[PDB]
Amino acid sequence: TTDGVYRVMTRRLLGSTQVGVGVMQEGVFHTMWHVTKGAALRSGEGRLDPYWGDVKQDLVSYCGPWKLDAAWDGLSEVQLLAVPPGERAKNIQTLPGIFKTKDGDIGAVALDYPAGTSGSPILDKCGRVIGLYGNGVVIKNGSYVSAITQGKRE
Amino acid sequence: VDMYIERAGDITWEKDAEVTGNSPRLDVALDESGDFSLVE
Numbered sequence: 341t342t343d344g345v346y347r348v349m350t351r352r353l354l355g356s357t358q359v360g361v362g363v364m365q366e367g368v369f370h371t372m373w374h375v376t377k378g379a380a381l382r383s384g385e386g387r388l389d390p391y392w393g394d395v396k397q398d399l400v401s402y403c404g405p406w407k408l409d410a411a412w413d414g415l416s417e418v419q420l421l422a423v424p425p426g427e428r429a430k431n432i433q434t435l436p437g438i439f440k441t442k443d444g445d446i447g448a449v450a451l452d453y454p455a456g457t458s459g460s461p462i463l464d465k466c467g468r469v470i471g472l473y474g475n476g477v478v479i480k481n482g483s484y485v486s487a488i489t490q491g492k493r494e
Numbered sequence: 495v496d497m498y499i500e501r502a503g504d505i506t507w508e509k510d511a512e513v514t515g516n517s518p519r520l521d522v523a524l525d526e527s528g529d530f531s532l533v534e
C-alpha cells in the first residue's frame with residue numbers, strides 16, 4: 341500500500357498486459373472504473389478489495405473511500421504523469437481545455453496515449469493529484485481529449 | 495484472471511517539463527454509463 345503510481349496488470353496463460361494505472365494515497369488505491377470493473381487487485385502477497393465506485397464518474401477506490409480532493413484551479417498548466425504500457429513514467433505539461441457540460445465545466449487534456457494508460461494521474465504544480473486520465477472524447481480529426489476526472493472526498 | 499498492481503514511480507511534478515497539446519473548448523454531454531460525447 342506504499343504511496344505512488346502503479347500499473348494495473350492482468351496475467352493470463354503466458355505474460356502480462358497493462359490495462360491501466362492508479363494512485364496509492366493514504367492507504368487507498370484510486371483508478372478508473374473501466375480499468376478494473378471492481379475486480380480485486382493483488383498487491384505483492386496481499387489483496388485489495390473495492391470500497392467505493394461510480395460508473396457515471398468512471399472511478400473506483402480500494403481499501404477505503406476516495407482520498408484525492410485537489411482541484412484544477414481553472415487557470416494553470418498541469419502535468420499528466422503518464423504511465424504507458426511498456427514505457428517508464430513520464431511527465432507531460434499542458435494547459436487544459438474545457439469540457440463544457442450542462443452540469444458545469446471540467447478541465448480536459450488534449451493528450452493521447454494507449455488505452456492501458458487509463459488511470460494515470462494529472463498533477464498541479466504542488467504535485468497534488470487533481471484527477472485521473474482516461475475518460476474522454478475523440479474529436480473530428482481523430483485526436484483524443486481526456487477529462488480531468490476527480491472524485492469527491494466525503 | 496489475475497489482476498495485480500506494480501509500482502511505477504513517485505508522484506512528483508517535473509521542473510522544466512515538456513509542454514505540449516492544445517486547449518480545446520468542447521461542448522460535451524455525459525451519459526449514465528460514464529461516456530462523454532460531443533454535442534452536435
Ligand SMILES: N=C(N)N[C@@H]1CCCCNC(=O)[C@H](CCCCN)NC(=O)[C@H](Cc2c[nH]c3ccccc23)NC(=O)Cc2cccc(c2)CNC(=O)CNC1=O
Nearest residue numbers: 374452453454455458474475476477478482483484528529
Ligand atoms: N485517439 C484515440 N482513440 N485515443 C484513445 C485513447 C485512450 C486513452 C485511455 N482511455 C480509454 O481507453 C477510454 C476507455 C473507455 C471509457 C468509456 N467511459 N477510451 C476513451 O475515452 C475513448 C473515447 C470514447 C469513449 N466512448 C467512446 C465511444 C465511441 C468512440 C470513442 C469513445 N475511446 C476510444 O478512443 C475508443 C477508440 C475508438 C476508435 C479507435 C480506437 C479507439 C483505437 N485506439 C486505440 O486503440 C488507442 N487509443 C485510444 O483508445
